[PDB]
Design a protein around this ligand. Structure first.
Ligand code: CO
Ligand code: CO
Ligand code: CO
Ligand code: CO
Lengths: 329, 329
């Protein structure tokens, strides 16, 4: 009690976040795209309706909060997030930071300038809305580019200044998490403020326990991205692993069994619109995972319980860990 | 009389466009950037004030209309353009198309999809504003990328459907104009609907007369970008030629003297804000060309007249050619 987090609807007590999905998207797009071309998604109204239906389904399954890690360059539309949050009665935490599609006006900026931008979005508000980011999302695409290194440093500095956590996108080994951690540590950022994301890309437990032992949160955040029979579909195959979702879920158990229950964050990296990829990709995705953001509570959590993971441990992973992570510290 | 063009303030008679600068920018930025980070420019209010002062100065010098060739990915803000137009009493024609910083949500699109996007901006309106584009801006960066080829084809198709002209960015030989022309012609687009831009990058008269003889407009559109003593400034040196502005202006005369007065468009490629380049670049630019968008009427036109170019010919270049170009045909 007492700790607060900023959501798209305003401040909430940390203790009310409850079952929280820490890496999700309402819509994965590009800066300005939803405003310029809403008909790409059918209409803005259709997108809202789809997202509200999806979040109500997650809510029915026990999800109380999602962290939308869409940055500026993922085309984050905080007004969209606020509308969907209100209609679905699910809290949404918005993000600042930069992903791997920064436009020239971002790419030309110094570390100091990027720090100011991230701070604006956390402390002042996003655009002219007054809605404040509650997380900082960064990305590397293998070895960090010089610009990506600036982004990571600016993220660390904004975090140090505000207490807001940092969360990352990694490629599937590199293993890019290690270089991210090195940069963060060089800036004096506490590992407990950082989630190294997409860490379920591989089953490298030495890598994962290595990060966890140092205090990092490990984001096992692509839980539903498993499918069979996609070989005649190149674009879909790129998204969905042959590894059964059961295999991804077993990684959660593997980390728990090794003593790292407090260092795990679980999510889907799901979405309700996706313009930064091939046209009609949603059709494929929704057929594979019709449960959307309810997949984790409906399938992953019961599977773990049925494998003998204690209910208290599962609550710790899905409630306590996100609360500790999101609490400005 | 009778012909109309769309401006950011609504339809105007073609005959009221008058002295028109056919390649300019209010602000060269990135999609969503002005909305997300207006303090980069001091404030949105400061940017408006600077632009209004600049356009009033151009207006005082005889400029009645500018064509703002900022696309979606140049961070075109049509509401900004409308505000500045109203305050300065200068017509502004807005653009659709894509320049060389398309985000993923654009890069993933088919020719048919891009055609629909360009048509939306021409026929329906930009974003939710009802303001309709009156030109289509495309760019190649040397040899056209596969995506850039799609953009050029979609531009040709949108032009064929609406009569709105196409205007291009080229690099400094390639000479990239030739490949652009080839693609446009393969789509059945009339050369008289097309301006091959930045054609003053080089003094290659065989190239320029080659295009003009085929019916293309040749955009001599970087008139003020000349300076001396910038060697201790790498970023400024990249923008400003050692060639005196007099040399650029002599190219206009060269084309007139060879019989191509009807195929020339003259502009500055000036701007009042510039976030897609190095910080504080405006300081450099404004010190070099304090006259801004009045440079052409104040310096270039009198220089040509004093070299013996007939006033009627100069009026034809600055009034008749833009009117013919912009008139949907
Ligand atoms: Co990611
Ligand atoms: Co994601
Ligand atoms: Co250009
Ligand atoms: Co330009």
């Amino acid at each position: 009690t007492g700790d607060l987090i900023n959501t798209v609807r305003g401040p909430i007590p940390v203790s009310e976040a409850g079952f929280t999905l820490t890496h999700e998207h309402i819509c994965a797009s590009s800066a300005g795209f939803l405003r310029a071309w809403p008909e790409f998604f059918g209409s803005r109204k259709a997108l809202v309706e789809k997202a509200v239906r999806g979040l109500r389904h997650a809510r029915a399954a026990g999800v109380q909060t999602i962290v939308d890690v869409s940055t500026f360059d993922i085309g984050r539309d905080v007004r969209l997030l606020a509308e969907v949050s209100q209609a679905a009665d699910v809290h949404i935490v918005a993000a600042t930071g930069l992903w791997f599609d920064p436009p020239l006006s971002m790419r030309m900026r110094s570390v100091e300038e990027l720090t100011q931008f991230f701070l604006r979005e956390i402390q002042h508000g996003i655009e002219d809305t007054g809605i404040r980011a509650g997380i900082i999302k960064v990305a590397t695409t293998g070895k960090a580019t010089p610009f990506q290194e600036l982004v990571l440093r600016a993220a660390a500095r904004a975090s140090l200044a505000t207490g807001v956590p940092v969360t990352t996108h990694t490629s599937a080994s590199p293993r890019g998490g290690e270089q991210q951690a090195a940069i963060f540590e060089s800036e004096g950022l506490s590992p407990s403020r950082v989630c190294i994301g997409h860490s379920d890309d591989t089953d490298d437990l030495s890598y994962l326990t290595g990060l966890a032992a140092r205090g990092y949160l490990v984001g096992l955040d692509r839980m539903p991205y498993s499918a069979t029979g996609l070989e005649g579909n190149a674009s879909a195959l790129a998204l969905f692993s042959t590894r059964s979702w059961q295999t991804r879920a077993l990684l959660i158990k593997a980390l728990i069994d090794r003593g790292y229950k407090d260092r795990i964050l679980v999510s889907h990296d799901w979405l309700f619109g996706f313009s930064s990829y091939v046209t009609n990709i949603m059709d494929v995705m929704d057929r594979i995972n019709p449960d959307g953001m309810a997949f984790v509570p409906l399938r992953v959590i019961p599977f773990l319980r049925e494998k003998g993971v204690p209910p208290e441990t599962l609550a710790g992973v899905t409630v306590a860990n996100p609360a500790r992570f999101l609490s400005p510290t």
